[PDB]
Amino acid sequence: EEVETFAFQAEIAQLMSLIINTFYSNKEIFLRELISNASDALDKIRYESLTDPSKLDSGKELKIDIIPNPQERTLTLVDTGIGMTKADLINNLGTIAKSGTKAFMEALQAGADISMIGQFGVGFYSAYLVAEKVVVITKHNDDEQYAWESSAGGSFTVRADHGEPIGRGTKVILHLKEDQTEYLEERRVKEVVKKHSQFIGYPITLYLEKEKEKYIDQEELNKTKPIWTRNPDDITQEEYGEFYKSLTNDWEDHLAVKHFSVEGQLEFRALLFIPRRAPFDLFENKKKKNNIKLYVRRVFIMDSCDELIPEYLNFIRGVVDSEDLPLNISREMLQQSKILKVIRKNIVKKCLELFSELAEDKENYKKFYEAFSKNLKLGIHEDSTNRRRLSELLRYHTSQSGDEMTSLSEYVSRMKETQKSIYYITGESKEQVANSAFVERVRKRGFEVVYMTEPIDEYCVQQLKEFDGKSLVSVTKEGLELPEDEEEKKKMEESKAKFENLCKLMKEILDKKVEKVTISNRLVSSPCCIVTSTYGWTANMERIMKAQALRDNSTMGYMMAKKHLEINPDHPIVETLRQKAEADKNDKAVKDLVVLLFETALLSSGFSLEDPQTHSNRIYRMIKLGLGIDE
Amino acid sequence: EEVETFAFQAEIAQLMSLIINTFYSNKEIFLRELISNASDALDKIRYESLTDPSKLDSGKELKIDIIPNPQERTLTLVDTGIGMTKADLINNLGTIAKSGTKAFMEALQAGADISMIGQFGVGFYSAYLVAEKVVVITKHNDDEQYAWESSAGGSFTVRADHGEPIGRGTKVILHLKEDQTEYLEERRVKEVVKKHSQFIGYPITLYLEKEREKEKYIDQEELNKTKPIWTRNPDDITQEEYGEFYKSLTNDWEDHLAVKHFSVEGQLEFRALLFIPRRAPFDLFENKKKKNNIKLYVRRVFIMDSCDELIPEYLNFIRGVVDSEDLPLNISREMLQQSKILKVIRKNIVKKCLELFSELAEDKENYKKFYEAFSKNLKLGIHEDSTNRRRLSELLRYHTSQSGDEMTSLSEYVSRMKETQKSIYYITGESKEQVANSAFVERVRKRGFEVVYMTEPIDEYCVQQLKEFDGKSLVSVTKEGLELPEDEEEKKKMEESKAKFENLCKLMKEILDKKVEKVTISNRLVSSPCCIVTSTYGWTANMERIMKAQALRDNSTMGYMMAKKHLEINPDHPIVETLRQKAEADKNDKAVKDLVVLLFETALLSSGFSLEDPQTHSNRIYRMIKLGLGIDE
Amino acid sequence: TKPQLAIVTQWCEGSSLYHHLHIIETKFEMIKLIDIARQTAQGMDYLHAKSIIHRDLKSNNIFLHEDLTVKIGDFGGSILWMAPEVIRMQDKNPYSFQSDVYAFGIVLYELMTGQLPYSNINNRDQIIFMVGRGYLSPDLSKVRSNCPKAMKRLMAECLKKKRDERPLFPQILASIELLARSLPKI
Amino acid sequence: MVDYSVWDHIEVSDDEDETHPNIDTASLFRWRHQARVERMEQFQKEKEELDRGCRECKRKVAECQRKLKELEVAEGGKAELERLQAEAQQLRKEERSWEQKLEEMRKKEKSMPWNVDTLSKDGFSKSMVNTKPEKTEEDSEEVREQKHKTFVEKYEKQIKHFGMLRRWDDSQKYLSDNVHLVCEETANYLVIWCIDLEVEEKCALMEQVAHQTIVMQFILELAKSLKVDPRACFRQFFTKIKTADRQYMEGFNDELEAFKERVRGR
Numbered sequence A: 001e002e003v004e005t006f007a008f009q010a011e012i013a014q015l016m017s018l019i020i021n022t023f024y025s026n027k028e029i030f031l032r033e034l035i036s037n038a039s040d041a042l043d044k045i046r047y048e049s050l051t052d053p054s055k056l057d058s059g060k061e062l063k064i065d066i067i068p069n070p071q072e073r074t075l076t077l078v079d080t081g082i083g084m085t086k087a088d089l090i091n092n093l094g095t096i097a098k099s100g101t102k103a104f105m106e107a108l109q110a111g112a113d114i115s116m117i118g119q120f121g122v123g124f125y126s127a128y129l130v131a132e133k134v135v136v137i138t139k140h141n142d143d144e145q146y147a148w149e150s151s152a153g154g155s156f157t158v159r160a161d162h163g164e165p166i167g168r169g170t171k172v173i174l175h176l177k178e179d180q181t182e183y184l185e186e187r188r189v190k191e192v193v194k195k196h197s198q199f200i201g202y203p204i205t206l207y208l209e210k211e212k213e214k215y216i217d218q219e220e221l222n223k224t225k226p227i228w229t230r231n232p233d234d235i236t237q238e239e240y241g242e243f244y245k246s247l248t249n250d251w252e253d254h255l256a257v258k259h260f261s262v263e264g265q266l267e268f269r270a271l272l273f274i275p276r277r278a279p280f281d282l283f284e285n286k287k288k289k290n291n292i293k294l295y296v297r298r299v300f301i302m303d304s305c306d307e308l309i310p311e312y313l314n315f316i317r318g319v320v321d322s323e324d325l326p327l328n329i330s331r332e333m334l335q336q337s338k339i340l341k342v343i344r345k346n347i348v349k350k351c352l353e354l355f356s357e358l359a360e361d362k363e364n365y366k367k368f369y370e371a372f373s374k375n376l377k378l379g380i381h382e383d384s385t386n387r388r389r390l391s392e393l394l395r396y397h398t399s400q401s402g403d404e405m406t407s408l409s410e411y412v413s414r415m416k417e418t419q420k421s422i423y424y425i426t427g428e429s430k431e432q433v434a435n436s437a438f439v440e441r442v443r444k445r446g447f448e449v450v451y452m453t454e455p456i457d458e459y460c461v462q463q464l465k466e467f468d469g470k471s472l473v474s475v476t477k478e479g480l481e482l483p484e485d486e487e488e489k490k491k492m493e494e495s496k497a498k499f500e501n502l503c504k505l506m507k508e509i510l511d512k513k514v515e516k517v518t519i520s521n522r523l524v525s526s527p528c529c530i531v532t533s534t535y536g537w538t539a540n541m542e543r544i545m546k547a548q549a550l551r552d553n554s555t556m557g558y559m560m561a562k563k564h565l566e567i568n569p570d571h572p573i574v575e576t577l578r579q580k581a582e583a584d585k586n587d588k589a590v591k592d593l594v595v596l597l598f599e600t601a602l603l604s605s606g607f608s609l610e611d612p613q614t615h616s617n618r619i620y621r622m623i624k625l626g627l628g629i630d631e
Numbered sequence B: 001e002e003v004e005t006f007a008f009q010a011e012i013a014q015l016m017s018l019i020i021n022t023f024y025s026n027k028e029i030f031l032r033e034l035i036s037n038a039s040d041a042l043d044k045i046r047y048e049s050l051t052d053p054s055k056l057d058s059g060k061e062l063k064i065d066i067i068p069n070p071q072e073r074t075l076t077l078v079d080t081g082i083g084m085t086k087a088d089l090i091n092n093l094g095t096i097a098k099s100g101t102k103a104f105m106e107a108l109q110a111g112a113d114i115s116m117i118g119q120f121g122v123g124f125y126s127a128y129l130v131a132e133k134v135v136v137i138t139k140h141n142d143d144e145q146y147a148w149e150s151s152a153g154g155s156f157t158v159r160a161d162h163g164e165p166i167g168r169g170t171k172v173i174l175h176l177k178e179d180q181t182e183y184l185e186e187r188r189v190k191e192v193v194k195k196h197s198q199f200i201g202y203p204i205t206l207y208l209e210k211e212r213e214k215e216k217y218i219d220q221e222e223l224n225k226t227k228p229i230w231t232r233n234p235d236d237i238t239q240e241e242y243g244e245f246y247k248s249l250t251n252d253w254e255d256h257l258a259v260k261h262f263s264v265e266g267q268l269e270f271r272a273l274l275f276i277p278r279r280a281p282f283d284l285f286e287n288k289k290k291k292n293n294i295k296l297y298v299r300r301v302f303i304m305d306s307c308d309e310l311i312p313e314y315l316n317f318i319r320g321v322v323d324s325e326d327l328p329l330n331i332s333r334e335m336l337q338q339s340k341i342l343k344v345i346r347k348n349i350v351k352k353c354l355e356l357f358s359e360l361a362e363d364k365e366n367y368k369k370f371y372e373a374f375s376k377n378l379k380l381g382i383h384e385d386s387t388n389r390r391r392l393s394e395l396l397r398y399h400t401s402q403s404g405d406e407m408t409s410l411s412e413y414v415s416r417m418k419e420t421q422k423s424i425y426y427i428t429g430e431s432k433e434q435v436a437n438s439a440f441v442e443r444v445r446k447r448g449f450e451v452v453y454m455t456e457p458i459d460e461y462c463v464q465q466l467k468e469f470d471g472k473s474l475v476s477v478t479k480e481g482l483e484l485p486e487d488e489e490e491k492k493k494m495e496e497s498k499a500k501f502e503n504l505c506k507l508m509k510e511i512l513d514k515k516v517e518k519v520t521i522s523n524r525l526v527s528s529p530c531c532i533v534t535s536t537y538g539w540t541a542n543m544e545r546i547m548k549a550q551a552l553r554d555n556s557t558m559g560y561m562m563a564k565k566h567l568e569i570n571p572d573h574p575i576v577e578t579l580r581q582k583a584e585a586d587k588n589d590k591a592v593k594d595l596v597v598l599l600f601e602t603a604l605l606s607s608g609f610s611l612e613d614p615q616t617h618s619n620r621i622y623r624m625i626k627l628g629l630g631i632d633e
Numbered sequence C: 001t002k003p004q005l006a007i008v009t010q011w012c013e014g015s016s017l018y019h020h021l022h023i024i025e026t027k028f029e030m031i032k033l034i035d036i037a038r039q040t041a042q043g044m045d046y047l048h049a050k051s052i053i054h055r056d057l058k059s060n061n062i063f064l065h066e067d068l069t070v071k072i073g074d075f076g077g078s079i080l081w082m083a084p085e086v087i088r089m090q091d092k093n094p095y096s097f098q099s100d101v102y103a104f105g106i107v108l109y110e111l112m113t114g115q116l117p118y119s120n121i122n123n124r125d126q127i128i129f130m131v132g133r134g135y136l137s138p139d140l141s142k143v144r145s146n147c148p149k150a151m152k153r154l155m156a157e158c159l160k161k162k163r164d165e166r167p168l169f170p171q172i173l174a175s176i177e178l179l180a181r182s183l184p185k186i
Numbered sequence D: 001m002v003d004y005s006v007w008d009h010i011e012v013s014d015d016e017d018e019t020h021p022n023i024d025t026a027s028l029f030r031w032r033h034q035a036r037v038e039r040m041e042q043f044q045k046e047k048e049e050l051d052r053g054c055r056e057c058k059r060k061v062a063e064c065q066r067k068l069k070e071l072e073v074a075e076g077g078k079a080e081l082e083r084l085q086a087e088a089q090q091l092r093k094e095e096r097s098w099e100q101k102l103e104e105m106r107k108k109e110k111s112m113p114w115n116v117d118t119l120s121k122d123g124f125s126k127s128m129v130n131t132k133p134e135k136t137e138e139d140s141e142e143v144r145e146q147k148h149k150t151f152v153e154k155y156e157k158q159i160k161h162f163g164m165l166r167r168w169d170d171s172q173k174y175l176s177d178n179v180h181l182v183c184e185e186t187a188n189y190l191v192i193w194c195i196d197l198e199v200e201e202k203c204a205l206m207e208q209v210a211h212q213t214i215v216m217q218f219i220l221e222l223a224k225s226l227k228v229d230p231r232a233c234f235r236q237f238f239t240k241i242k243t244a245d246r247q248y249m250e251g252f253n254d255e256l257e258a259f260k261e262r263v264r265g266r
């Protein structure tokens, strides 16, 4: 019956220590914070000018300087902004979690051409990460010049001074520490400024001392203006290329460019790119990927391409500038990581549209395809959402087009009336597969076969199983059937009974090895060949799998497929073999001939022999017999 | 002139807004914080009873309870700890950046023997992240029961309460809001507790309502049952306890193989515990899987488990825990700062893991099982690591030409070589039968030397870097210029024979037409007319096969730089002698061309290389079969 | 003069689990038959807690991966995994969690018996009508010699008659785990 | 201030950081997508039903107002009027209930999250192809002479400023802006500069300048082997020579000694 209210308090010393020793990770962002504050002040004075020009009679230009001094340990950062008055100096620079930018934005009309950085409040106390005593000198239009001095303890002193006049800006003098005296070295300052704040709209300059000992004025800290902000109808080709050269350190130019922008609640503006030739360490990974950055009001937030674009589109460079997002207390990470996955969808969609548009003229597509073709087949393997739009940018060599690649949809046009399914073959070279045993029959009836001669082609063709309602059938798998005449079927049925005896005898001599021996219709001018079964690896896949460095072996026996043998019932050699087998049940010559035939069939059908010395000895004996030497 | 001193201030509403929704992700965190406040409280009452009893007449036991209510949307966190008075309900829970744990630790007389979590003073508003109204009921040994209540924003009430007897402790009631009402279930609370804070020293229990046949209440204390082992002395633990911990830390139906347990009591303090799985996981050589093997623990509270540099790449099978006592930590307690101590931890872990590997190599029954599964990961250390190469090469165990089915070692093989020998001989092939009776190792196995077999790709990848052993060099038996130290009488005989086989060299080089760069005569064969060897600088045959077969090659550069080869013949075989005699007379005949092409192609086939166009060879064989049987035409 | 570095692989489609037990022999011990049954129980529990249903789990859908890792999927006669409510023709929405439980029970029967269910009668129309009315069920005597009793209770509970007296997945998972951590041999 | 309560309920259907080790993904994405589309279509059916019901109810309300205006002149209809009043009042109160249900349904479609196609709507988009004539190489002898004179003189001043040093990272950045600027003529003038430094007999300066020059000429010879200009091949040899292995280091040393002997005898 004695409820009594109170008010929330705050403890100051622990608060300051916690801020400046806990909030941030690195010790190099104080320069970013100071540059952001200077940019805001300049923005304020610029906006205030364009109603009465009586506010620019003391200093007409807007600039930013950096002056190191390694004799006194100072890092002065002069600018020419709006300045601060005494009351405002006490009330914003000495009160944690209160910002003077928000008040200026709120009192300002309703809608203006202004966009400033900073709404939290704890940003200037980050100078004490590397500092021992900070001094601020300031002057406004309607006050005098004041000096502010503190040491991150519990008090600050504010006094009027006489000294060197400034026009209307602010000086920030930083007395550096003893073990942090490596920020007066210029390579370090240049690296920090270029990585963090390089798209600021104002001219940062340095004040080095090189060689009388002169006074150098290197302005080159930023001299590449952002180009995605302006209208897309005023940029003329070449202007893009320069921005590409000065973004990633190249000696050449691009090959395509996209400049889209979405609106609504989540809005951004992107400037994707495509390079000319593939970098030679593209799949070396290891190093953190920095091909797509992410900016908020032209200040770096974080870089990544493991969650902004997929892993098979790592060759694309660009910029993803946005306007407002849920940032962290250190503006280095994003709460609600789902926003990134929302961005990724739009980026992928626009990239695919760009590829489709570029594939129109058939003169620049070859340059893009001969250097970026592995990534498309990598994408087909793991992308279920868009595998139909990525299966139309595939070009293949074919045996009705000499030395020009054809497209898959173009294939389906020039088919025959009764043809079903697409035929393909996978090998190791373009001439090893052109003249093989399997092809020599379907290529005599006017049909078509495509040539998939590469290692990743198997990974692709294992996943893509049908195209436009047509099935991809191989020429080397246990009994392909092709449209044919009835009379041929009757003749083949008769021949099957004709050769029904030697077929079993070969199965007798050849033990566990082959699994079933049969007559085939895929050969016209070769004695015999080897085919595999439906559910299991093919020869090429087995060859690739046996050559992987980091992979296990206890599962090899489960996946390999058996092999059948095909006896072609027209070659004279088989005809005489039947003659021999008909009279004699078992002779040494028949055994030797059968073994040698199987062995050459294994050698010509892609398989690797398990003991070459026996085959070599068998060849040497025959060489010796036919040219003399007795033994 | 005039100097004015001031003092710093703050803005309370904006500061609270910053705390609530700027530096806290993964809302679930709130629960952890609350638990970390109960445990600390309990610890205090466990320290005030050591000097004198009779401060425990109110409660005997210590416990942590959770009660969810699905009807009024509340979640209670009863705890029987030290409690809070009235003067401490306004100076501790009503001031940003003010703790009571730190003041407690200050007053101790440097006796240590206590370790409590938290010294920053902002961890109740994490609980404010999920609820809209917070109520606290508290009692102390020398006050009356009091009630705190707040709804955020410049206000809180501290009235007195007479409505319920609590012996001694605290009771926190959260009033959930409509959006986040998934924390009243079983699975969510269970998962959060089991994943974030399960090694706390006290029995967290739960009081959910079940139905059986009917609102009978259930006691499921099993939220934590496994105690932390890594705080005990290493000598006082047995094998079954270690196995049970390993089983109920990564679900598996078998125990471990070896276990390491050490401590580092220097300026840095941490204690680790590493195991070795009995059988390798299936997906341990993937691309970007979320690695979770070594988990950090600062004062028995989970921090992070991914890390970049805690163990190098090849030590992936090792799984266990690492506990510390002090580290530079963020404000969210999920991320490490400035990442310097990690180097020291990684160095120490690598050293002790190698020590364990050497220790396990004494018995000859477990090492076979260890090496049959994790052999590949050692042959990466010789490649990447460069300061531990010397002592990582002893644990390699190859086959040999004198051990039937028994893997020997390099050091054992060094102590079996004859005096004259000055180098190690190895052969890199595809299988063990294909390599057992080849043509290269035919002279070296007749004198009585020893060759070591190497049949796997990672052997090439390692041997390419390991180039010495005990100051002795490894030389292969499939490369150019291999010398066997022998008497100079047979060397003079070879020199005499190197003059009558001279014209044949240039005839063969002319006919093969820039497919072979030399055709010399050499001493490596006894019963084989030809064999092909490669150059001293360049890929061997099997390495080239492996390079070509693999995907993602980027084959623009590699194709036009490698694959040099030679050819060498022997002056004893009848075939070569007959060929020389025949080519002596006529230098433009026809049979000799066919014969030399056949010999070169067969030698190419049985030496590791792959034919460029396999149809021609097959057609030649078929033609000879036809002609030797009388089919003609 | 600029070596290389070993490169990792991506993944591959491991053998289906209907191939292991029907087209090949591939007979495992009793302990591993327990572990597979637990893995399919846990995975279906996760789906069933986000209102996702599956409508079928044919034994070929299960993919016994490298080493030993079960992974349910969807890629696809099959009148042998269907419930006595699916073969009805009313309201076009007979599907619920209990039908998934029934399909899991039939998978368990195939897994520890080693044979196709309903091997006696071979007529598709006859079987569908019989399951419709004059209903039958697989005879439970066809079991392994060393199979435990705790699961024989679980199997009889999964498929009784109706969709109201069938269990939900947490109880099944708990029972399987309890039986698993008590079995040296029996 | 600092209110982030709007970005609390986003939903993605193909999220890859929430999966089970016993479900294959792949098919999980399709299940999630189908569920989202079905729920959206059910709510769309409800909302369109309410909207068209409100539209036809407003049309019927206008018709009833017309009927009331007609009855203002006529008479007789009371039971129909009472039935219409009662039914319309009950329908209007249940429609108010339905409207409140929709007002809460917007908050629920905030709790049931934003999808991909509610957060943003597209604006402008343009795309270009850059059909540039990638064939530009001026006559070999004329480029040799003109580059020799101009570039060789200027970058000879540059290479004289650079050669007195021995540093690597400085050499790395100097070769970076050299491959920005310099060509083979600068390499030839560096060769002749080393040649006439041999005649001047500065042994230590020979060692330093020969170190740098043989590194540059090894870049040159790798360029000759690959026929790729020294502009395009600078970073790989630099990064493999700063991390050069022991064997590569001794090979480089012996080749340095051999080249020094060759030039001294030249």
Ligand SMILES: Nc1ncnc2c1ncn2[C@@H]1O[C@H](COP(=O)(O)OP(=O)(O)OP(=O)(O)O)[C@@H](O)[C@H]1O
Binding pocket: A033, A034, A036, A037, A038, A041, A079, A081, A082, A083, A084, A092, A093, A098, A099, A100, A101, A117, A118, A119, A120, A121, A122, A123, A124, A125, A170
């Ligand atoms: N160089 C400067 N010129 C003018 N005003 C300044 C300058 N530096 C700081 N201020 C003032 O300091 C206040 C804000 O200080 P602080 O940097 O702590 O906050 P913030 O602007 O929100 O943060 P941030 O550093 O992220 O931009 C504002 O009133 C701003 O005008």
Ligand SMILES: Nc1ncnc2c1ncn2[C@@H]1O[C@H](COP(=O)(O)OP(=O)(O)OP(=O)(O)O)[C@@H](O)[C@H]1O
Binding pocket: B033, B034, B036, B037, B038, B040, B041, B079, B081, B082, B083, B084, B092, B093, B098, B099, B100, B101, B117, B118, B119, B120, B121, B122, B123, B124, B170
């Ligand atoms: N259940 C509790 N029993 C007793 N004291 C408590 C309890 N919960 C909080 N306190 C007290 O609240 C004060 C401030 O706690 P707060 O949560 O703000 O931060 P902390 O204790 O420093 O950190 P943390 O919550 O991470 O352990 C401390 O004096 C602490 O003892």
